[PDB]
Structure formats: C-alpha cells, structure tokens
Amino acid sequence: AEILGIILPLLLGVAFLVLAERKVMAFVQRRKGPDVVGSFGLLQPLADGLKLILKEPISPSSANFFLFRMAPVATFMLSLVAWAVVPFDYGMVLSDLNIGLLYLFAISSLGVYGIIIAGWSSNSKYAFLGALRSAAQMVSYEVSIGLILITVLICVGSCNLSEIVMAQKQIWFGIPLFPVLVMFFISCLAETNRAPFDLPEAEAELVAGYNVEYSSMGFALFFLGEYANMILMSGLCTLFFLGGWLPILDLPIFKKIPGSIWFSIKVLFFLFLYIWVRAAFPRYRYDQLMGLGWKVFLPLSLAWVVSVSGLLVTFQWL
Amino acid sequence: FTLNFGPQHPAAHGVLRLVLEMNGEVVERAEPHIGLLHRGTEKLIEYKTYLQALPYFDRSDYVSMMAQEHAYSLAVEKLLNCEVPLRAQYIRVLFCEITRILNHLLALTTHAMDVGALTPFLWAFEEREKLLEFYERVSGARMHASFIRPGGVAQDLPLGLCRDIDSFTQQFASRIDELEEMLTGNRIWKQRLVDIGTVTAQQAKDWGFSGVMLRGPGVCWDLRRAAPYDVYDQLDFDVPVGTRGDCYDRYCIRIEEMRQSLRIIVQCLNQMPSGMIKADDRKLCPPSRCRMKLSMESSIHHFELYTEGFSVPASSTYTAVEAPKGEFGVFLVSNGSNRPYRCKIRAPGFAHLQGLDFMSKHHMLADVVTIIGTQDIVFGEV
Amino acid sequence: VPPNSANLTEARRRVFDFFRAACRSIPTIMDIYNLQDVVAPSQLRYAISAQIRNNAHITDPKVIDLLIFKGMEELTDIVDHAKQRHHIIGQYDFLKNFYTSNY
Amino acid sequence: LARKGTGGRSSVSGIVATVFGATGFLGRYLVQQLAKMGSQVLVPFRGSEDSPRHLKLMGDLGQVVPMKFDPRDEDSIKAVMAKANVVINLIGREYETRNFSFEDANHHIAEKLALVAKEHGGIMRYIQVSCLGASVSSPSRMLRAKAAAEEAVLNALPEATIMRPATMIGTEDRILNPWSMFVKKYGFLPLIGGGTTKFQPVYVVDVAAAIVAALKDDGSSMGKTYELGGPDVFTTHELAEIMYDMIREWPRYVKLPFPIAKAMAAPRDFMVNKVPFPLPSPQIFNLDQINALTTDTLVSDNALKFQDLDLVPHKLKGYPVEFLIQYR
Amino acid sequence: DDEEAEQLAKEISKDWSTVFERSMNTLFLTEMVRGLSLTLKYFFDPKVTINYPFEKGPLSPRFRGEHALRRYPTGEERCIACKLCEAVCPAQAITIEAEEREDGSRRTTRYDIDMTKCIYCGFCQEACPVDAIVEGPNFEFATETHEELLYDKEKLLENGDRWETEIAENLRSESLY
Amino acid sequence: RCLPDGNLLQTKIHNIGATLVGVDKFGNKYYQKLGDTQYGRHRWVEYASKDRYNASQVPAEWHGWLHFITDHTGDELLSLKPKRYGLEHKENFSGEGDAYIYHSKGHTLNPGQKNWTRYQSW
Amino acid sequence: MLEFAPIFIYLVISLLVSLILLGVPFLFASNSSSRFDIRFYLVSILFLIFDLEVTFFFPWAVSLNKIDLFGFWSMMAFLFILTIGFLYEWKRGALD
Amino acid sequence: AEFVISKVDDLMNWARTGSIWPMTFGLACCAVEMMHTGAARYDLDRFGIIFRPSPRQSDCMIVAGTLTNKMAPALRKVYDQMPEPRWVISMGSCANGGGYYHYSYSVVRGCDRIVPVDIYVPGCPPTAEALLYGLLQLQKKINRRKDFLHWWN
Amino acid sequence: SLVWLEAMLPLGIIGGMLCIMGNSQYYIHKAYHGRPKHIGHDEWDVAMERRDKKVVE
Amino acid sequence: AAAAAAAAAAAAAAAAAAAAAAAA
Amino acid sequence: VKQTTGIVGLDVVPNARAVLIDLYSKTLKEIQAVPEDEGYRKAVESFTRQRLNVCKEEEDWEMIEKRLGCGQVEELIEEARDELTLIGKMIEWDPWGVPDDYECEVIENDAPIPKHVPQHR
Ligand SMILES: NC(=O)C1=CN([C@@H]2O[C@H](COP(=O)(O)OP(=O)(O)OC[C@H]3O[C@@H](n4cnc5c(N)ncnc54)[C@H](OP(=O)(O)O)[C@@H]3O)[C@@H](O)[C@H]2O)C=CC1
Ligand code: SF4
Ligand code: SF4
Ligand code: SF4
C-alpha cells in the first residue's frame, strides 16, 4: 500500500545515515569522510550495500533458517513499524492512534525480544551475554524514557502523537522542559546503543556481540535496524519536545512554512546531535551506564513528573 | 572462567593476546601472552656491526622511534668514550623530545580511542603527521629515522627545520589544550580512568615500572633529572609527578609531559650551537661525502666504518635513557670485535605489561583495555 | 623446582614422578586432542616410556632434571590447548642413500 | 631430474610442471606436492585471477607461476607449456556446462594438450588424470569421455602416464562435501541406488602423492595406466556411515531407486537449452554421476595399484576425513 | 583511609555557592558542553585532509623510497662493484656479483636489491662511495606479485635513469650535508 | 567534468582559484593554489586520464615539485634531465598483464630465463 | 480502533519488505565470486515493576484536569511508595 | 550482447572497489603508519576503506609489521574467516617479505607464507601515501576482476 | 566557510527522505480519499461519516 | 561480588611538579 | 600535621617519631647477633645510632627530616623496618666471616666515560 512510501524512503534514510554519520563524525575529526565513491560520497551507501550483497557467505547454513534468519527481520520490522504513528505533518501520520505513545512504548518492549532472541540464537556465550547486557540496558533506559514521556504527556492532553505535536503551538516543550529534552536525548542515546553509552557496542565487542552467522545480510540488517531505530528515537525527541512540525511561528515572508520540512530539519538536528555526541565523548563502560539509568535518569525523571504535574496542577494549566 | 581477550581494535594494540581469568565481569587475573611480536632482535644484533644494529632500535618502539636510537647511541658512546659536540646533543634532545611528543600524542589518544573518544585520536594524529614532517625532513623516513648514530647524529638539520619546528611549537600548546579540554574535564573520562589501575609506589618500584607509571605513584624519578644524559642538565623542565597513581594521573602526566617536552623543544631551538654535527673522531663517525671523496685517509675510514665498524672496546654497560614508554635501557655487552655481543634491550612494556596482572585485578573487563592504554604497551619492545 | 638431584637417586625418583604424571594425564590428552580413536592408551604409554628410556643413559643428575623439565613443559603445553593436535598424532642401506644425494 | 637441493620449499627438482587442473580440489594437493618437494609449477588458470591465489603460496617465489590460458584456444596452451618438462592434466568436469560439453572438457582437451605437448618436444613425463572405471561403454558420459581421453593421450603421445583415481575424498571435495550440507537437510541423506555401489575412494593427498611418485620414478610408469584406487573397498552407504561418525549427526538415510533419481536429475540436463542462464552446478543429483553410480565398476582390477609406486594409501577414517569436523 | 580521604575531599567543597557551582556543573553537563563546543568548532573548520592520488604529502630530498642505481651523465653505470652497500646493508637485501667487463673497468654482473628484505634505511646511499645507489623519492611501487618486488640485477634499479631528474636534484640539494 | 563518480570532483572543486603551473608530456596538469589556505593542499596534479588514473603517473621531473620536496616546476628540471640515458616514465604497470609487469631473470615468465648454475655443465 | 488497520497491514508489508531484504543477498553471489548473573534478574524484575508503575502513570497523565488536586495527591502517594521501594533498592544496592 | 555483462562487471567491481573494509592486522609500526593512513590527512574512510576490528566482515586484510612464527597460526585462522571475495595487502618489508628480520628464527619470511597476498605495499616503513597507493592498487586489482564474465565462462 | 555543506548533504538526502515519508503517505491517502487525513478522528466523526455517506444517497 | 569498585572520587587536580622548579 | 607523602601507598604516619624510636631500638638490639668484625654490623650500628639519636633529640617529624637528611620519616620508617627484616634474615643463612680461599677478583677497570651518556647525577 502506502507502507512502501514510508519504508522505502526510510530504507534510503538509513542507508544515507550510515554515510551521514561517517561524514559528520569525520568532519568533526578534521577529515572528509566518504568522498570518492559518489560525487560527495553520495554513492558510498550504495557501494557498502552492493558490496555486502555480493559477498559470498562464510558457510551456507541455510538449515537453521527459522531461528535467527527471521530475528533480524523482527528487529527491523519493529524499528520500521514504530514509524506508523510518527506524524510528519498535520494529517501525515499513517495511522493516528489515540494511544499512539503507549504503542511506541510497546514497540520498544518488543524490540527487547528482538535483541534477546537474536542474541540467544548466536551460540556464543560471550556474544549472548553481550546481547543480554544490551537488552538490559535498552530496557533500563526505558523506564526513564517512560517517565519522560509521562512528563510530556502531563503537559499534553492525550497520547495522540499528532496532539503532542499540536499541543506545542504556543511553545515547544523543549524550552520549558529543556532539562527533560537533555534526559530524553541522553536516554534515546542509551536506549538505542549508538551513544557515549555503547560498551556492548565497543568497536570490536559489537560485531562479535550480535550473531555468529553473519552472511552480510545479518550485519547490514542490524546496522540498518540501529540506524532506523536512531532515526525513530530522533523523530521522538522532535515530536514530543521540539515542535513536531511546527515552525517558530514568526510567519516569514521568505518562508512559506512547509510542515514536513520542519519535521525534517528538526530530526536532522537530532541526528547530527547523535553523531556529534558520538564523536566528542568517551564510552560509559556499562557498569557506570546501568548505574546512570537507575541512579541518575530515574530519580531525575520521577522528579520531573512530580514537578511538571505540580506546577501544572497548582496553577490550572492542565 | 577464562576469556581469550585479544586485540580489541587491531592496528592500535597489535598482538595483544591476554588470557583473562575472569569472575563474571570482575577480572581475577590477566595473563598476557608475549612473543607474537618477538622478532629475533636480541639475537639479530649479535650478528651485525654497531652501525647495522642502530635501525633495529627505531623498530623496537614503533611509536617513539628516536628515543631508542638515542638510548643505543648512548650505549656505544659509553664504551667508545666518543665525545659528541654540543649541536649533536641539542639536536639529539630536540628529537628525543619531539619523540616524547610523538609518543604521548599517540599513547594518549590511542588510549583515548580504546576508551571511546574517537576524535582526540585523529587530532593527535594530525599533530603526529606534522612532527613526521620533521622526522622525514631531517633523516628521510617518517617513522624509522635511523638518524641518531653512535657518534653524534647522522646529518645536520636542513636549513629550514628550526623555523618549522618553531612554527609548530607556537601552535602546539593549543593542540595539547584541545586534547585536554576534550578529555580532562569529561565526567565520562574521569569515570573511565579515575581509580583505574592504581599502583602504589612500592608496586611501581617492585615491578620495575620506571616510566610515566613510576611518576604516577608519586616516585619523583625521571632519568633526565636523575641521570642527565645530554643538555638535559642545562635545559629547564619540570617532571610532572602524580599523587594518586590511577590511570587518570598517568594521563594527566602524559598530557603535562607533553608540555614540558614542548618547553624542551623550544629551548633546544632557541639555544642550538652552530658546531659540528658528528664527533670529530673520524674512526667512529664516517666522514662526510665531500671529505671521503677528496681525502684518501677519510675514504679509508668511510670504507672501514661502513663495512668493518667501530670495534668498540671490550666492556659491558647499561645505558638507560628516559624513553617515552619509560626507562628504555640497552645493556650492551661488547666483545672487542666490531659486532656487539648480547645487546640486551631492557624495554618498558616488558616490565609494564607485567604490571597488567596486578593492575587489572578486580577491575571490570572493560577496564583491561584502559590499563593497556595507560601502560603505553607497544609490543615491539616486548 | 630446586634441583634436589644431588644424586641420580632423587633424579630417578622425580623421573618416575613425571612418568606417573604424564600417564595419569593421558586421559585429558586423548580428550582435548581426540586421539582416543587413532591411538590406544597402551601406545601412548609406550611412546612416553620410549621417550623416558631413549634418554635413560644420562649419568648426569642435572641433565636429567632439565630433561624432566622440558618434558613437563611439553606436557603442560599439550594438556592445555597451547599446541595443536596434528603433531600429537605424529608425536605418538648405504646405496638407498647414495641414490638420493651426496650427503 | 636436475635436482640441486635437500628437501623442498627452496630446492630444485628439474620439474617445471604445468598442472593444467591446478585450480581444483585435486590440483591444490598435487601442486603442493610438486612445489614442496621443490619444483616449479606453471599453474594455468581459466578465469578469475582469484582461482590460483591459494597456490601462490606453497611454492617459494616463482616455484608456482599462475598463468592465464583459454582452454579452446591453442598458441596459449603452447605458451603455458613453453618452459616445461612435466605436464600433468587435471582438466575434467562431472557436470556438463552450457559452454563446454562433456567431450569439450574431458576428452577434446586432454587430446589437445597431448598434441600441443607432443609438438613441444621436451615434455618428458605427461601424466593424464581420468576417473577409475573410465572405460568406454560406461554409462556416465563423463567416463566415456574420460576413456576417450586416455585413448587419445596414449595414441597421440605414448609413454604418458595415466592415473585412474577413483572418487577422491578430502577437504573441498565433490564426494563428501555435497553429502554434508545435505545432511543439513535434517540428517536426510539420499544415498542413490540403495548403496549397492562398490567404489574405492582415496585420500586426495595420496592421489597427489601417486601423481608425483610417477614423476620421481624412473623410465617406468610411462604409458602404464595406473588405478589409484585406495584401501577399504566401500559402498556408498558404508562411506556415509563414516561421515556421520565425524559430523555429529544421527544416520537418517533413505533409498532412492535409480528411476526416481534420474527423474530428480532430469532438470539441470537442459544445459545446452537454457542459453541465457547457467545452471548451479548439480552437486549431489547428477544424472551422469548417477549413471556411474549404477554399475559398481569403480573397483581396482588387476591393473597397477598404489603398490607399484612404493606407496600405500591412507585410510578413510581419522585425519583423511577429518575435514568433516567443520560441519559438526 | 580511603573512607577518610573521601570524607575530606568532600568536606573541601562544602560551602554553599560552591556546592551549587559543582551541582550546576554536574547536572547541566557543563564539562561536556565544552567538549561539544570544541568538537563543533572543528566540525566547521577547514579539513586537514589530502585527496591523495591528485596531491600527495610533503616530503624532503632526504626521503628514502625506491632504491635506484644512478648513472654517470655519460652513461656508464656509476656502480663500481666495491660491495660496500652489500656490506653495510642491515637486512642484506643487496646481492652483488662483480666481473671485469671487456672494457676492463670493474662492474656488477649481478646487483639485485631484495626490496621485500630491505629496511629503506638509506645506509646503501651513505656507504656507496660514488653515490651509485640512491633512494628515489618514488615510494609508490606496490607490486601485485612478490617476485616483481625483488628488484633484479642492475636492470630495474637501472630505471633510476627516469628518476635521475629528481634524484640529481635531491642530491644537488642534499650534498651540502 | 562529468565524473560524479570519483574524488576527481574534489580536485575539480579545487582549480577554482588555482593557477596552472605547467603540464608534463603525459598531459597531467600541475596546479598550484597558494596564499589562500590549507598548506599541504596547494600543489596537486590533474591526471589527464580521468579514469584509470593512479599515482606514479607523475614523471620524475614533477614528482619533486608535487611532493613539496623542491620548488622547481617540471618545466625547470626538464633542462636537467640527462639526454644520454634519460628514460620516459612507465606508470608502474603492476599486474596489468605479463610483459608489462616486471620479471626477474629466472621467473619463467621472463623471455630469456637465465640459468644460475655457476658450474658450466659438460 | 479504526486506525489500527493501517498498522495491522503494516506488520505484514514490513514482513514482506524484510523477506525481500533477506532474499536479495541469498540470490546473488553465485558459484564464482559465567554460571548466572542474577543482576540480570534484578534489573529485569525492577524494569517490570517500574514499567508497571509507568502503566499506572499513563491514565493519571492523560486525565489530570479531571482529577483536580485529589487524583494528583493520590498519584503522589503511589509515587512516594514507589520512591520508598526505589530507595530501598538503591540503598540495598540493586542498581549496580 | 556481452555489453550487459561488461557493465554488470563494472558495477560489481565499482562496489567492491568503493567499499573495501580491511581487517587491519596492524602488528608493529606499519600499523602506526596504517593509523596515519587512517588518520586525518590521508583519509582511508574517504576511499570507503573502513578499518574493521573483526575478521568476520572484511573485504581485505592489511597485514603489517613482522609476522612472527607465533602469530602465523593466528593470522591464518583470521584469514580463513573472511568472506570469499577477500584480498590481502602486505604492508611494510617485514609483512611482505622477510624484511629486516628475514633471517630471524621467529619471523616468517613474508606473510606470503601464510596467506595468499594480492598487493605488497613496498618500503619497510611505507609512507602513509605509499600504503594508500597500495590500496589504490588493490582497487585496480578489483577493477580487473570481471567475475560475471567468468561465471558465464 | 561553507565546508560543512559536504557533510550536510547526507543529512539533506536523509531529510529529503523523511519529507518523502511524510508527504507520500499523505498524497497517497489524499488520493484514495478526496480529503486529507483527519487526526483527531473520534467516534463522533466516524458516525457522522456514516450518516454523511448515507445522506448523499 | 565484593571486588573493590572503582570509586570515581579523589582529590582535586593540582599539577605536582618536582622540587627542581627554580634552583634544583 | 603532615598532610600526605607525595608517594602513593606510603601513608603518612602521625606517630612518626615514636615508631622510629621503637624501630631503631629494635634494630640496635637485634644487630647484636651478627659478629662484631663485619662491615654490616658497623654500618647498621652507626647509622641506626645516628638516626635514633636525631630522632630522640628532635621532636617534630619536620625537624627529624631537616637534621637527619634522609627524605621523609615515612620512607625512613620503611627503611628501618626493611633493615629489621634484613637483620632477622641475615641471622639465617649466616654469610659472615671470610672463607679460607676467597678468590675475589677486583676487575677494577677505569674507562673514561663521555658524560653525554647517562651515568647518573
Ligand atoms: N573430484 C572427484 O571426486 C574425482 C575427480 N577425478 C578427476 O580428477 C581431476 C581433477 O579433479 P578436481 O580438481 O576435483 O575437478 P574439478 O571439477 O574441481 O576441476 C579441476 C580443474 O579442472 C579445470 N577444468 C575443468 N573443466 C575445464 C574446462 N572445460 N576448461 C578449463 N579448465 C577446466 C578447473 O578449472 P576451473 O577451476 O577454472 O573450472 C580446475 O582447474 C579431473 O580430471 C577429475 O575428473 C577423479 C576421480 C573422481
Ligand atoms: S636501505 Fe639500503 S642498505 Fe639499508 S637494507 Fe635497504 S638496501 Fe640495504
Ligand atoms: S652501489 Fe655503491 S656500494 Fe654498492 S657496489 Fe656500487 S659503488 Fe659500491
Ligand atoms: S617492515 Fe619495517 S616498518 Fe614494517 S613493521 Fe617491519 S620494521 Fe616496521
């Protein structure tokens, strides 16, 4: 149907995000990133792809095809189905669910399955414990994202994402709850792995940390999944806190105010922030990381639900 | 529970082949495996002249090249009694110190890339590709500059090298500041390094650390202040010495030792006497191309010094300089012949990597790469 | 281990000690490197005994100490997966020379 | 020959061979024998330069010189056999390919290399490699072609050794490696004809050791068609019994009557028809390999065996089959 | 002791409007925003990179790259076979065999530098009396096959005639040292 | 232009202010953009073979000027290249077929494979 | 519910898309080129509890104008009990 | 005609030559020079080269430094688990051929004894540009593959 | 300096893909139904749509 | 596990040179 | 009053003087068990007496350091305790007395050393 018009452009978005990350994180390091393949490396994603596709397997092993040949399919299908409820402009959400937000929460709770299964089917004790650690991290910064969304929900009326982005016509929730945006970003960094928070994704421990039978398709699908999960969890820091598709409302004469273009600009800002913050900060070691999701972003998230509930109950701002 | 923790990022720590006996995530013992980079250096040098022996030293520590040629040269001048000029000493230090900078720029930001900070690596390696414009300009090869020969130094600086080293030193305090502003303040750095691999001074002495891992613990011991082996007794510089011993002190030292090395570079630049480049003793220093062609007695020495060698007299000395890794000393027994005789190379990283066993006990498995970071373990010397 | 071999008697005692050690360790050898099908325990005992007997004419005690040390080194590097297995399976008149070479 | 060395890997053996089928399962063992006993090998490859890369090692700096050549075009075969005194021929196929037919790949080449070696007077020993039981009137067109190849290599070039290796087992082989990866169809092994076939496999290392042993031999082993059979005359089912000992799997065979198999291998036999697409190299079900599987003529008769090369083959249990462990 | 050390290192920062400074520099991650700001400054600054095949890194006339046997301006290989470089070579790459040519003047029948078994230390350039062997700044001679990388006896090292225009320049500028 | 498939676009994004200093025999156009900025990026070469280019096509007359070892454009060292033994460049034909690649004198691919046996057989 | 049918078909069309992304590599490239870590049960039970309490947060979040200052204080009592549980877990040391 | 095969080979080769991620067996200094070839000045992420830290997914393997007789089995075991369209680059004299340590007992006389090599970056400490030119020669070796034309024989 | 634009370009062609994600599933739904999508589409609106398609007969 | 945890508290940064700053 | 020894691990001892007096009295008492005509006993006696004396005279640890110029009193305690270990060790495997033959070869060479080599300061 029109699900093609949201999966194919998202596939291109992820394929070009691998290049956007390499290129931005390279510009940060005073060096041009992928720059020979395409006019500006623009074909470099297609080169990575068409290479991974043409790489002969290390072992065919098509026998075990129901266990872990559909688990990356599951992870990727979840990362892609959480895009339905995400609205790009007024009346551009594919399916306006009146409980949209809780549906995103459930999609994350199933991504936990994706990780756990795709790690258990890899019969590698080190890789399986790594996948379990990554799942426990992704699920420990999910109580903090949960409470952050309860804050941005108290501010809004309903869970309807189109309403949460329509409830910011007066002011984006990034301005009053900026401390919360910093906690949602630092959680979306940690919910997904791509972050200062990626010890399970320490350059080596990642590849040997998701599966044993790569065949290339598994490697690409995990990275395509991580980069879509990243485009998504950056398309949430821009619905909830930044104005989903809202301008600054100055109503310029030069600017005809397209909606989806504003949503795009903001999700680009948060993707660039993902990259910038991957470049400039050391990893957290997963032993200070789990002690940051419980001892730092849960108390500071609980306080925020009580602060944004109080300050909105006393003065009847609800 | 045994885990074969190998090279996490190859091309940074090449042949690291620890065999960690873990306890969940807490490491109970780390057993490093050596020999994967054991080239026959301590045997091959017994088979070649004292000149042919020098190129092995730049290949002993591959991130701080000229410091080992400077430790060897000072071991074939300890025997030869070969007094080198003032300019040879000043150039020899201006490049041993440029090498200290070339090493700390790598051993900090390769460590900082193992910890996770990706950008300090590439900034420091642009700095290192500026300093290799000096190595490559003064000798020829960007890394292995077989330049600090036994008598003096191979050949004089080009006529534009001090100006360029100055134009680099002016802009190098800022690069250290950036490497520092990006890593020193970070709470993700301190957390990854504070109280990591703490070495009480008795342990750093016992295990013969003698480097930036002996001045972390607070033992004020620099073999440029203890045993001044060049103009070092003339040059002013403060040896930064830690107060806790944790991998965050050794980093802060290596990032201050990278500034005091800048002081020493700027001094060696500002006071470099226009003297001869090699020892006048033409039976230890091959005469210049111009002289050996015009003078018959110089031609004979150029022939018996590039084929026969010195034949340094019979003795046995342990000359140890302060290489960036630590006290790199070359114990050079010398039979009277022109070839050395058991040129044993005490190389820090053989004593430091011993320390990994007790440094990384009860540290989490992700710390075992931070320890290997701050030890500056380069397996060429191990 | 200090060379208590102030005589051939102590050296021979520890030779028998090392022999008992290798023999009682043959199980793990056969297990880790999978020789329980190609080689028989009789044959591995035969090979260890032929080793210890091939170098039995050593009237020097310290040389026997060092031989036992090399043997313990070999064993400890065979017990653990330090060395591979395709050598363990291998470890277990004049005219016909003249026709081949000059040496 | 003009040997100046001690062992190999830097010695010389006066054998500048051109192992025509070097980039193949038999070729990698034969090239390693010829270039570990220290002799040049002019490995000629057919297509991708990645084919003989695994042969640039196992020979010391020009002891193995991979060369490019077109099978149907001479004046290139003559260029590969320019500087050579031994010419082994391992060029053979078990499956018809749309471009090269069974004769154009088994017989019309061996005859062609034979003729262009005869012309290049100086090929002292020309070994010709064909399957055992490759006698005319054999069902499999591969064996009839391989018999015509023997008859044309001996006629056009006498005193030319002819090995007759039976199905060769070893790593990356075409006999055991298809059965495994079909045991990965859940232990389902389709032994065809009910395992009544009696064929004598042989560790490929020993076939190579025989191919080199007829080179190091004297004037004998010239024009004498050996039969590199091997020990332990097996049956297809019995050989499969040994695989399941290495790969940890439970024997779950089935029997296939020959009509059922030949119908299951009726596709992939339109190779000359389906022009715009090459078929994927029938591994286990090959109508011609099945025609050979029918009659158990793959047994060494009173013809020359390994015993006439001072050589005794390895068994098929233990190491000479331990390449199956990678399937456990 | 670490307990008392902690108690005191936390009683050093224990005065209001200092606890507040440290709290607002560990909550509004402020050490980290100075990292992000520097990283941004470098994201926008010009890039120290080099699109290689078209422009290459700076070198010096002393640069040691592909070995080249020089010639005298009037032909005649400069390499009289003294074997000093064969002697000085640390890796023993150069194998020299000498024969009085028919002209009568000594020359090397075999001058084969094994580049793979060669450390590029420039000892041969120093040891040679007539500057017969010099390292051309080539350094771009990666070979598909190892046998090509062994530079033959005086035939491929004789390709220095092409590099003489640069080797003569580097020697005319380095001979002052 | 018409190459959005290479880093040749990075060179053609240079040359916008650069001056062309000479062009060697093969066609490689040697450019210089100094003064503006970014030392180390102020001398390059446009290989005049927009496909199938590679390094080492830069002749020795310019391979000095282009690596910043000297300041003599190849139009100035061409009066110093020796006429008697001067040889044109060869592009480093490494792998591009035999008889273009180099071969030792025993490789059996070299026409005239010499025999090294020091003893002269009878 | 009416808007659930687009995601209902989304699951299946994304299944198709991922199956094609799976079959693309499979077609090309032819012949020639620790006993137990109980902290993972503590972290898991604790996420279970905190996601239960977020489940209880959701209706209180979306309906807070209705429950004027009494639903708020009842939720703050529920949250003070959550905080007592979380402080007993912090002090006991399950967050490590 | 054959033109479609020529273009599909051009496309496959453009892919495998654009994105060629090597498992950089960075043993010794040539790994420090390789790190300079991965550093800011000579980008290797420009040419697509992404230094993989695992042998599992890597098109190449830039073995550098002295392959010791003890690191020979590990190098072989790593080379055996690269996906088949793999290549190997020898960087530095010690890795390509015997090198400074040709006669050392513990040093293999060039990785050409363990893995089959496709481009030997020459020069004992190759200039970072020299390793970069070795990789730009590996790119040529890809551009001369035409694997589809050979699959059609 | 406009050097960052080269690194902005991949973020642009990943922003030009979310614009397509948003406008495709809008102008595809604006095609099957003559009207844009209604976000706050409560049961009152489905009831009115039923009675509306029943009023136009 | 009772293993000594890496306590990220310490004394504040004070560059500690050696006593030979001015007059050895 | 001493804040900390710069050295890590050598914890500052408040009762420096008292434990130093204890250790030096123990050392003087324990050294009596070695023969008197041994250089080791003359040395131990002499320097232990000097340090015990200066420790008894002065009161502050700072004055102990200032007069007895041997670093810090914590390192001094380390030295004294290590000396006690050595005297209790030397009692065992007694090496005192010169044997009958005692072939000792003073290979006292005196090569001039260039001084741009390290040596020491
Ligand atoms: N495999 C077995 O079990 C048995 C095989 N044999 C015989 O042993 C010999 C070698 O066996 P093996 O290596 O396994 O066989 P393969 O089928 O693997 O082919 C081996 C070699 O033959 C070459 N080749 C085959 N057909 C052609 C052709 N038409 N044109 C050019 N080259 C061709 C191959 O080139 P390329 O790789 O480029 O295709 C390769 O170099 C053959 O004669 C075979 O029949 C004997 C007993 C049974
Ligand atoms: S640089 Fe010259 S002397 Fe040194 S190893 Fe190479 S060829 Fe021999
Ligand atoms: S190159 Fe130099 S050292 Fe070597 S033989 Fe020629 S002149 Fe002598
Ligand atoms: S070849 Fe030379 S540069 Fe390369 S690793 Fe060996 S010694 Fe170092």
Short mmCIF file of C-alpha atoms and ligand atoms in Angstrom, two decimals, chain B residues 37 39 55 58-59 62 143-144, chain E residues 116 118-119, chain H residues 27-31 33 64-66 91-101 123-126, ligand 4:
data_model
loop_
_atom_site.label_atom_id
_atom_site.label_comp_id
_atom_site.label_asym_id
_atom_site.label_seq_id
_atom_site.Cartn_x
_atom_site.Cartn_y
_atom_site.Cartn_z
CA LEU B 37 55.79 -9.75 18.13
CA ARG B 39 61.23 -10.71 16.29
CA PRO B 55 67.96 0.60 12.67
CA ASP B 58 63.78 2.72 15.82
CA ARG B 59 61.91 -0.60 15.18
CA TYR B 62 57.35 1.92 16.90
CA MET B 143 58.81 6.66 11.18
CA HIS B 144 62.15 4.79 11.28
CA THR E 116 60.91 -7.01 0.48
CA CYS E 118 65.04 -4.25 2.64
CA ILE E 119 64.56 -1.75 5.54
CA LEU H 27 51.17 -5.74 14.03
CA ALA H 28 54.05 -3.34 14.85
CA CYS H 29 54.84 0.16 13.37
CA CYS H 30 53.37 -0.41 9.94
CA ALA H 31 50.14 -0.38 11.98
CA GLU H 33 51.82 4.11 9.60
CA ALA H 64 51.53 -5.02 8.59
CA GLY H 65 54.66 -5.45 10.75
CA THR H 66 56.69 -8.59 11.50
CA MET H 91 52.30 -3.60 4.27
CA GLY H 92 55.94 -2.96 5.22
CA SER H 93 59.04 -5.06 4.42
CA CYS H 94 58.54 -7.42 7.44
CA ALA H 95 54.97 -8.27 6.33
CA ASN H 96 55.52 -8.55 2.55
CA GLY H 97 58.88 -10.35 2.55
CA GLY H 98 61.46 -11.46 5.12
CA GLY H 99 62.45 -7.82 5.73
CA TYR H 100 64.93 -6.62 8.39
CA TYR H 101 64.17 -9.93 10.13
CA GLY H 123 59.04 0.24 1.76
CA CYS H 124 59.82 -1.03 5.25
CA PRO H 125 58.05 1.97 6.90
CA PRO H 126 55.85 2.67 3.82
S1 SF4 L 4 58.76 -3.81 7.62
FE1 SF4 L 4 59.86 -2.13 8.68
S2 SF4 L 4 58.24 -0.59 9.15
FE2 SF4 L 4 57.16 -2.52 8.61
S3 SF4 L 4 56.81 -3.49 10.62
FE3 SF4 L 4 58.76 -4.34 9.83
S4 SF4 L 4 60.35 -2.99 10.72
FE4 SF4 L 4 58.38 -1.89 10.96
#
